[PDB]
Design a protein around this ligand. Structure first.
Ligand code: SF4
Ligand code: SF4
Ligand code: FCO
Ligand code: FCO
Ligand code: SF3
Ligand code: SF3
Ligand code: F3S
Ligand code: F3S
Ligand SMILES: [Cl-]
Ligand SMILES: [Cl-]
Ligand SMILES: [Cl-]
Ligand SMILES: [Cl-]
Ligand SMILES: [Mg+2]
Ligand SMILES: [Mg+2]
Ligand code: NI
Ligand code: NI
Lengths: 263, 581, 581, 263
C-alpha cells in the first residue's frame, strides 16, 4: 500500500530533533522510513541538493496537495526580513508558508518549533517565532522537548499511521499520551522529595544515594514530558536518573525562567 | 567579472555561475556558488552560511554555571562538545579543578561523540556521494557476499542477507515513493563502485542507521540523555556508588556494565564495517586522492584534545595533539596559544556583522557579534538572492584566521599535525592505510583523504573509549569515586572579574569558547567553531577559506548535477549551525 | 529378575543395571535406571522424579485470587503457564468472563513462552546431544560458511565469523577449564555431524543464548518481569491507555511498539536459525527417526490451547487442537473432557503417596496429595539408593492415565493430533518437513521427530504472536481497551461452593489445574502437568509411561556413556519441578 | 589467566534463578560463562550426566578445594530424611554440605536459597530450609527475589571478579548496592501515593493513568530490592510499572504475609 507522505523542513535549529528521531529503538528509524512513511523531503538526509532538492519539494507539495504531513524542525526568524534563515535565496518563512498551505496537518518537532527554544531566549536576536504564531489555519501537534524523546517521536508517528488520526491534545496542542503529566508526577525520586531528602551539593552522600534534586534546581515539578516513565535512549536513563535536575526543556520559555540551579 | 590571485589560486568570477542552495546532507543551512570556465572547471567558489541564531548574544547576563546548557544547543549533531568547551572555559576563568573521574568521564563523552558523529557522517551524510543506491538493484547477491567476505570478518555477509536487503530496496522504490533517494545523482559518471559494492555499502548504510542509536547509550548513562546530555561546572553530576546502600540511585556496577557492553560493540562495528568500507571507497575512487586538496597542503590547525592528566591542558597531557602548520611547511609544527591576541582573530569584512573597523581581525576576548544583514549588490533583492556578491558581505559565518593565515581544521588537519609531530600510532596507521591503497602520503591531502582520516579517527576514538573506561575502573578499584568539585560552586567564591578559554577537538575540528565573567554573570561569550574556520568567507586580503580553496580547480562532468561539489563539501562534514551559532 | 509384557514391550529387569542420576540439561531432578541385555539393548527403563515440594498442599486455605502466584513457581522454565492455568481455573469456578484484550494478551504471553522455551531447549538443553562441541575446533571456517549459506538466508555466516567463534572456543578450552563441556560424550560414535556442522551449530548455540533474553521482553511489558510475570483473576493488570492523559502510566503506543519489534526479531531468529538447524540435525541423524518411538504411535493426548474466542474453550475457539488417540488409531481422534471422572485419573501404586486404595486412579477433583517416602526393597537403603525397586514405589511423580491408557503429551503429540484432525497449517508444515528429509510421516514418531515438531511449533507460535498482536491493535483501533473484569473480584460475590478446571498446552504438553473453592478459600487444588504424564511411573496393570516406553528397545554403543538415553529423554524436554510440584 | 571456578548446585527449586541469570543483558550470560568465570558444575547446562557429572563435581571440589565459589539455587528439605530432594541416590543436603565445605564463599541465589520461598510456605510439607540455617561456617551472600533481577545477578558476579571481593552486605547478608533501599523508596508512582491517588479496582481510570497500587495490595513499602530503579529485562519494566503491586518476593516469608491483595 502507498506510505503516507511526510515533508520535513528545517528553520533555525541545531538538528537535535532529527538526531533524536534517528535514535528510535522501536520502530527503528530505518523501518519508519522504509515501511511506515514516505519521507519525501528532509534536508539532513536526502540525496538531492540545490535545484534537485527544490524540484523534489515542489513536486511533492503539488502532487500530494492536501495529503502530506508537514514536519517542522526549528523555527522562522522574523528579523532582517526573515533572512536570518535563508533557503534557496529567500526567507525560510516563505518555504514554511508554502509547505504549510498544502499539508493535512503539521507536527512541530521540539521546543524550537513548539515554543521558540534557545534562539528565542532573551534577547531573541533574530525574532525567532514558533510555528503556531505564523501558521494559524492548520492543525499543529506540538511535540516539545530539547529534543523530544526518540521513542515518543516514533510513537506519535506510528499512532498517526496506525490509527489514521492525530493524537488528542491538551489546550497547548501537546499529545495527552506523553505530555498529560509532569516529570515530577512520575519521578522515581519522589520518595526522597516527600521525605525532605535532598542533594545539597554535587556528589554529596545524598547524591550518591539518588536523593531528590529539587534543591539543586530541578524543574520537574512544572514540566510536562514522559522522561521519568518512558525514559531516554531505549529506557537507559533520563536527566534526573543520571544526577542532574530537569532543566524544564519541554516547557515554553524554559531558558528564561531563571538559573537552572535556582527555584 | 574580476580576477585576483591568493594562496596559489586564480579567483576568477567570469563564466557560468552555479548555485547550490540548499546544500543537503549537512547539519543546518548553507549556500554554495561557483563559477566554471569553458572546460567546466571551477575558477571561483563561494561559501555562505544561510542561518544565524546569536548564542553569543543570548549568553550575556547568564549564570556561568548555566552556560553549558545554552551553548550545547549550538548543535545537536556535535551534541555535547560545546557543553564540554563551556565547562572547560568557566573552570578556566574561575580557577576550578575537577576530580580525575570527572575528567575521564568527560573524555568518554567526547570519544563517544567522535565514534557516533564520524559513523553517521560516513553513511547517512557523505555516503550517498560515493554509493549509487539505485545501482545496488543490479548487484548479484552472491558476488556481494564474496566481496564483503574478502574485505571483512564482519558476520553479516550471507547471499540471502544481501538478497533480502536488495529486495527491501526493490519494494521501497517499486511504487515510485523513493523518499530520500528521489531526484538523486544516480548514474552520474563519477559513481565508480561496481554494483556489488553499492549493495554492500547500502546494506551497511542501514546497519549503521540502526547501530548508531546504541553508541549514545554511553551518553545516557553519564549524561542522562542523547541528544543534549547534562554536565556541570566542577565535573559531572553522575555520582558514583559501587558498594554502598543506595547504589540503585547512582552510577553502579550494572550501569558500568552497560557502558562496557556499548564500547565493545562500538569498536567492533567501526573496525569491521566502517573501516573496510572506507578503504573500499578509496580503492574504487583513487582519482579523488588528487581532488579537493585546498588548504590541506598549506595551512592546518589543531588545538588538541583529550587531556589525560586531569586539569592539565599541556602537550604532555593531551592525547590528541595540537599544533599549526603554515606555508606548506610540515617540518615546522608551531605551538598554538588561544590567549595570544595575534593568533586567533575573526574578520567580518565579508560577513553580515558590524565592527568599528571591518579591516581588522578581533581576537575573541575582543569579539563582537552585532548582526548586520547587508548583501549589497546581489543579483535579485535582499529577500531574493539570485547571486551573492562575494566582493562584499556574503555569509553569516565570520572569517577566522591564525596569525593572519587561512587554515583547515578537522580529521585531516589533526592527522597531518599528529603525523608530522611524529606520533608513532598516527604515522604507522597512515603509512599502512596509504600503502594498502598504493597511494603516496600526499594522497591524504584530498577530498578522499578527509573521508579516510575520519574513518581512522573513529577507530582511534573507539580504542580510546576502552582506555578511558579502564582508567575509570582502576580509580573505582582504588576507592576513588569523586565526580565533582564544589569548593567554588557558589558565586560568592568567584573572582569579581575573570576570564577563561575552553578548547577541544570536536569531530569537525578545533573548537574554542572564550568567556569573561563579571559580578557573577557572563560579560562576554565568544565561540569560534570548526566549521567557522572551514566554511569561512574571505578576509581583507581576499584570502579564501578551506571550503572555497578545496572547491577551486575542480572539474565537473555535468554542471547541472553538482556531485563533485557535494563530495568535497561533505568530506569536511559541514555543521552550519555550529559555524554561525 | 522378572519379565512381563505391556503395550507391545517385554519388560525384563535381568542383566546389567545402568543408573543415570543426576539427569542433567533438564529442569529439576530426575533419576533414570535401565537394564541392558548382552546385545547392549535396553530391556527395562525406570523413570524417577527425585524432587517434591507440595504446592497442592500449600495452596489449601489460600485466597483463590492469590493462587496464580504460588503455582507459577511450580516452574521457572515454563514460567507463566501455571499462572494462566490458575486464572483459567478460578474464573471457571467463580463464573468470570474476561474482556477480549485480556484473552489476547494471555495468548501473547503463552505464544511468547512457546517461542522462548522451545528455542532454549533446542540449543542449551538438547543441542549438545547432537552437536559435538569439541569437534567444532576441527572445522574449516569457509566450509562452515558455505554450509550455513546453503541452508539459510541468516546474515551471520561469514568465514571470519565462524573463525572468531572457533577461536573463542579454542581460547575457552586452552587453559583446561572446559566448564559445561567437561567430561562430556564428545567423540561418541553416535555424533554424526561433520565438523563444519558442529561449528555452525555451536555458533548458533551462542547466538540463541544471547537472543533468548530478548523474547521475554514481551512478558516484561504485559507482565512486569520474566521470569515469573504477574497476572490477575479477571484478566490482566496491564491497563491500556493509548490516547489519553497519563498514558505514560499504562500500556501505550511506545510499549506496543516495543512488543512488535520483539515479535519480528523472534520470528526471524526461529525461521532462519532454529528451523534450518533442526532440519540439518535431521539430515545427519535419520536413523533417529526410528529410535525412541515409545507411545507416540499408540497413545497421544492434547487438551488444546489458545482460545481465540474469549472465554470459549470449545473446539471452534482453540487454535491449538485438543484430542486423544489410543490403540494407534489415528483415524479416531477422541474428545477430551476434564470433568469426566472416567477420563483423567492419577495412580500412585508406584509413587511415594498414600491413597485409600492404591489399585484405583483418582480424577483430580478427588485427588489426594499425601506424601509417603517408601522406596521399599531397594539395593542400598532409603537414604542411599543404589537401585530403585520398580516393582514397588519408585518416584515422586504420580501416574496419570486417560481412560486407563498411558499417553504421550507435548509437541509430537499435539502435531499428531492436529495433523489427523486435518489442520491445514500443521499438515502442510509436517509434509514439507518430512519431504525435505525424504522420510515417511511415521519418521516423526521418534526421538528425532520430537525435536522436529518442537522447531515446527516455535515457528507456529511466532506466527501466532503476530496474529494476536494484530487482533489487539484492531480492538484498540475500535476503542476497545478493557483488560479486566472486576464484577466478581470480591469474595462476597463468589459461590459459597464451586469448582473449576483450567487447562492449556504448555511447551511440554497438556496442563490441567483443578480447583475447588469453599467459603472464599481454596478447598482443593490439584495439578496434572505434562511431565507428570511423560515421566509417569507404572500403574496397577504394569503399564509404562512415555519415557519408559521410548527408552525401551534402544541400542547403546557404550553402556557407561548414556548418550542414547540422554537424547531420548531430552527430546521430551523434561521439567521435573513441573512433574512433581 | 585462569577464571574463577564456580560450582552451581540445585536443591528444591523451580529453576527461575538459572533462567534469570541467562537473561543478563550486560554482561551477556554467554560472556560471563566464556570470559568472566569458569562455570565448572551446573546441572541445567552441563554436558555430563550421571557418573560423568559426579566425576566433574568431585574433581572440581577436590582440585579447587578452598578456591571455588559455590552458587546455590533452591534449598534442602529436612523431611523424609532429606529424600524429598535426591541427588545420586542420596539426600541433596549431603551434596550441599560437601560443596559448602570446600567453597571460599557461597552465593544464595533467590528467595529459595536465601529464605525458603514457595516450598517453605505454610504448611512447609518438606521442611524446606534456607542455606544459612544449614551451613553456618561460611560467608553467605543472600541475593533474594523470586527470581532476582538478571542484571543484578550478573553485576554481583562482575563485582566479585573485577574487585576481587564480596559485596558489602546489610545485617541480613544482602548486597547493599541493590538491597539497601526499598521498592517504595524509588518507585515512580510515589507521587500518586503521596497524593492519595490510588487504583481501587483493576482497569479503573486510576489504573489507566498509572496511579499507586497500595490499595491493591502493593508490598513495595516493606520490600528491599532494585526493581523500581534497575528494573527488569534490560530496563523494560517491573511488576508495578506493568500494573500489579509488588508481591514482596525478595522478603523472608512473603508468601505467608497474607493475601497479595490485602494490606
Ligand atoms: S528529582 Fe525533580 S522531578 Fe524528581 S522528585 Fe525531585 S524535584 Fe521532583
Ligand atoms: S505502587 Fe507500591 S511501591 Fe509504588 S508508590 Fe505505590 S505502594 Fe509504593
Ligand atoms: N564537530 C562539530 Fe560542531 C562544528 N563545526 C563543533 O564544535
Ligand atoms: N511446559 C511445561 Fe512445565 C512441564 N512439564 C508445565 O506445565
Ligand atoms: Fe531540536 S532543533 Fe535543537 S535547539 Fe531545542 S528543540 Fe531546537
Ligand atoms: Fe528462583 S528457584 Fe524458583 S521458586 Fe522463588 S527463588 Fe526459587
Ligand atoms: S530537561 Fe527535558 S529531557 Fe525531560 S527530564 Fe526535563 S523535560
Ligand atoms: S514482587 Fe519481586 S520482582 Fe521486585 S517489584 Fe516486588 S520485589
Ligand atoms: Cl527545509
Ligand atoms: Cl522556549
Ligand atoms: Cl546440584
Ligand atoms: Cl520465604
Ligand atoms: Mg563566533
Ligand atoms: Mg498433581
Ligand atoms: Ni555541529
Ligand atoms: Ni516446567
Amino acid at each position: 500500500k502507498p506510505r503516507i507522505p511526510v515533508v520535513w523542513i528545517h528553520g533555525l535549529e541545531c538538528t537535535c530533533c532529527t538526531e533524536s528521531f534517528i535514535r528510535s529503538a522501536h520502530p527503528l528509524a530505518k523501518d519508519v522510513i522504509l515501511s511506515l512513511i514516505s519521507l519525501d523531503y528532509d534536508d539532513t538526509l536526502m540525496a538531492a541538493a540545490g535545484t534537485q532538492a527544490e524540484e523534489v519539494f515542489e513536486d511533492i507539495i503539488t502532487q500530494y496537495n492536501g495529503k502530506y504531513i508537514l514536519a517542522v524542525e526549528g523555527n522562522p526568524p522574523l528579523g532582517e526580513q526573515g533572512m536570518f534563515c535563508i533557503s534557496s535565496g529567500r526567507p525560510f518563512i516563505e518555504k514554511l508558508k508554502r509547505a504549510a498551505a498544502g499539508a493535512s496537518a503539521i507536527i512541530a518537532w521540539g521546543t524550537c518549533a513548539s515554543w521558540g527554544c534557545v534562539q528565542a531566549a532573551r534577547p531573541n536576536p533574530t525574532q525567532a517565532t514558533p510555528i503556531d504564531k505564523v501558521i494559524t489555519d492548520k492543525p499543529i501537534i506540538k511535540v516539545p522537548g530539547c529534543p523530544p524523546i526518540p521513542d515518543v517521536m516514533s510513537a506519535i508517528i506510528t499512532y498517526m499511521v496506525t490509527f489514521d488520526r492525530l493524537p488528542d491534545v491538551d489546550r497547548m496542542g501537546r499529545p495527552l499520551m506523553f505530555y498529560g503529566q509532569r516529570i515530577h508526577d512520575k519521578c522515581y525520586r519522589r520518595a526522597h522529595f516527600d521525605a525532605g531528602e535532598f542533594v545539597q551539593s554535587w556528589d554529596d552522600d545524598a547524591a550518591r544515594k539518588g536523593y531528590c534534586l529539587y534543591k539543586m534546581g530541578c524543574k520537574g515539578p512544572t514540566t510536562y514530558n514522559a522522561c521519568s516513565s518512558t525514559r531516554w535512549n531505549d529506557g537507559v536513563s533520563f536527566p534526573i536518573q543520571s544526577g542532574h535536575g530537569c532543566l524544564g526543556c519541554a516547557e515554553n520559555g524554559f531558558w528564561d525562567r531563571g538559573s537552572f540551579y535556582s527555584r | 567579472s574580476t580576477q585576483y590571485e591568493t594562496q596559489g589560486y586564480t579567483i576568477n568570477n567570469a563564466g557560468r555561475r552555479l548555485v547550490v542552495d540548499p546544500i543537503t546532507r549537512i547539519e543546518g543551512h548553507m549556500r554554495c556558488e561557483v563559477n566554471i570556465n569553458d572546460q567546466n572547471v571551477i575558477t571561483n567558489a563561494v561559501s555562505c552560511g544561510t542561518m544565524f541564531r546569536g548564542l553569543e548574544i543570548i549568553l550575556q547576563g547568564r549564570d556561568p554555571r548555566d552556560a553549558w546548557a545554552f551553548v550545547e544547543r549550538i548543535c545537536g549533531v556535535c551534541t555535547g562538545v560545546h557543553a564540554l568547551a563551556s565547562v572547560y572555559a568557566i573552570e578556566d576563568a574561575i580557577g576550578i579543578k575537577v576530580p580525575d573521574n570527572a575528567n575521564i568521564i568527560r573524555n568518554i563523552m567526547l570519544a563517544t561523540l567522535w565514534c557516533h558523529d564520524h559513523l553517521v557522517h560516513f553513511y547517512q551524510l557523505a555516503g550517498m556521494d560515493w554509493i549509487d543506491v539505485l545501482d545496488a538493484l543490479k548487484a548479484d547477491p552472491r558476488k556481494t557476499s564474496e566481496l564483503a567476505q574478502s574485505l571483512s570478518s564482519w558476520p553479516k555477509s550471507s547471499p540471502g542477507y544481501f538478497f533480502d536487503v536488495q529486495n527491501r530496496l526493490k519494494k521501497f522504490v517499486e511504487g515510485g515513493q523513493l523518499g530520500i533517494f528521489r531526484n538523486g545523482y544516480w548514474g552520474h559518471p563519477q559513481y565508480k563502485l561496481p554494483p556489488e559494492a553499492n549493495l554492500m555499502g547500502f546494506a551497511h548504510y542501514l546497519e549503521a542507521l540502526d547501530f548508531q542509536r546504541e553508541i549514545v547509550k554511553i551518553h545516557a548513562v553519564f549524561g542522562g540523555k542523547n541528544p543534549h546530555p547534562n554536565w556541570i561546572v566542577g565535573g559531572m553530576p553522575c555520582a558514583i556508588n559501587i558498594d554502598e546502600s543506595g547504589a540503585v540511585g547512582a552510577v553502579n556496577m550494572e550501569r558500568l556494565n552497560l557502558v562496557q557492553s556499548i564500547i565493545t560493540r562500538t569498536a567492533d562495528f567501526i573496525n569491521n564495517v566502517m573501516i573496510p568500507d572506507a578503504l573500499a571507497i578509496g580503492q574504487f575512487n583513487k582519482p579523488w586522492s588528487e581532488i579537493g586538496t585546498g588548504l590541506s597542503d598549506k595551512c592546518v590547525l589543531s588545538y588538541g584534545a583529550f587531556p589525560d592528566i586531569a586539569n592539565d591542558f599541556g602537550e604532555k597531557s593531551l592525547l590528541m595533539p595540537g599544533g599549526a602548520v603554515i606555508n606548506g611547511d610540515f617540518n615546522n609544527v608551531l605551538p598554538v596559544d588561544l590567549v595570544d591576541p595575534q593568533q586567533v582573530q575573526e574578520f567580518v569584512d565579508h560577513a553580515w556583522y558590524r565592527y568599528p573597523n571591518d579591516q581588522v581581525g578581533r581576537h575573541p576576548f575582543d569579539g563582537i557579534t552585532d548582526p548586520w544583514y547587508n548583501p549589497g549588490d546581489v543579483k535579485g533583492s535582499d529577500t531574493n538572492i539570485q547571486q551573492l556578491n562575494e566582493q562584499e558581505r556574503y555569509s553569516w559565518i565570520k572569517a577566522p584566521r591564525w596569525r593572519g593565515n587561512a587554515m583547515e581544521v578537522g580529521p585531516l588537519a589533526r592527522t597531518l599535525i599528529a603525523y608530522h609531530k611524529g606520533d608513532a600510532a598516527t604515522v604507522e596507521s597512515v603509512d599502512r592505510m596509504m600503502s594498502a591503497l598504493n597511494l603516496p602520503l600526499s594522497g591524504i591531502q584530498s577530498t578522499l583523504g578527509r573521508i579516510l582520516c575520519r574513518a581512522h579517527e573513529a577507530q582511534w576514538a573507539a580504542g580510546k573509549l576502552q582506555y578511558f573506561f579502564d582508567k575509570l575502573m582502576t580509580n573505582l578499584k582504588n576507592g576513588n569515586l569523586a565526580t565533582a568539585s564544589t569548593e567554588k560552586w557558589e558565586p560568592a567564591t568567584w573572582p569579581t572579574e575573570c576570564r577563561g578559554v575552553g578548547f577541544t577537538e570536536a569531530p569537525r575540528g578545533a573548537l574554542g569558547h572564550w568567556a569573561a565573567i563579571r559580578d557573577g554573570k557572563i560579560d562576554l561569550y565568544q565561540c569560534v567553531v570548526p566549521t567557522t574556520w572551514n566554511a569561512s568567507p574571505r578576509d581583507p586580503k581576499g584570502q579564501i577559506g578551506a571550503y572555497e580553496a578545496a572547491l577551486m580547480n575542480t572539474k565537473m562532468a555535468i554542471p547541472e548535477q553538482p556531485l563533485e561539489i557535494l563530495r568535497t563539501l561533505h568530506s569536511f562534514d559541514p555543521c552550519l549551525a555550529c559555524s554561525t551559532h
